């Protein structure tokens, strides 16, 4: 399991949550906007691909992503 | 040391902070999406206690390994 | 690469972002509860520099001051950029 911290532009935010849900990822937003995204190790590449694809220029556009190891995952 | 990310509903939020304080855990609340995310630093032993509180007062939880922890503190008169 | 979570007092916040930019660190500020939380991506070597800034830029409120920091390992880092 991996925890992904994705920092993206506000402009990109809404469409990225749509794309992330569409792709079956559970995500959380905190305002640039920061997304926290839990994924299984295999699905990581898919997630990045979505993020890459949904980051556009406002003239300039970008996204920064961190992939963090998870000791354990729990859903209650 | 572990860093715990807990995503919970607002309805659960206020009670959980009360329960978390009560249990001697230092926590931080972020208003997110309508949900709240709690970041909870804990020692490896106390992790189970923390999870139990969350479970009982609600949720999705991640337990992250911490390379290094630091606290700086000052008093003056 | 390391991800740093720094919880600091609001009063310290603006000055710490100034100091963190000045030191060439990219940081992100979250409004939280009272305290502000900074997320700071850094290379393993620069970690000590970052801590020092945080330590230095935490002052006493009112009498009392403090900051709490977590340094998290990063499996992988990714950056995507475009111009038009």
Residue numbers in the entry:
A (entry chain A): 1 to 31, 41 to 67, 92 to 109
B (entry chain C): 1 to 33, 40 to 64, 96 to 114
C (entry chain B): 1 to 33, 40 to 68, 92 to 113
Sentences from the paper on this structure:
On the basis of these observations, we conclude that PstA is related to the larger PII protein superfamily, but has diverged through evolution to specifically recognize the bacterial second messenger c-di-AMP and thus is structurally and functionally distinct from the canonical PII proteins.
The C-terminal His-tag of the apo LmPstA structure forms β-sheet interactions with the B-loop, possibly affecting its conformation.
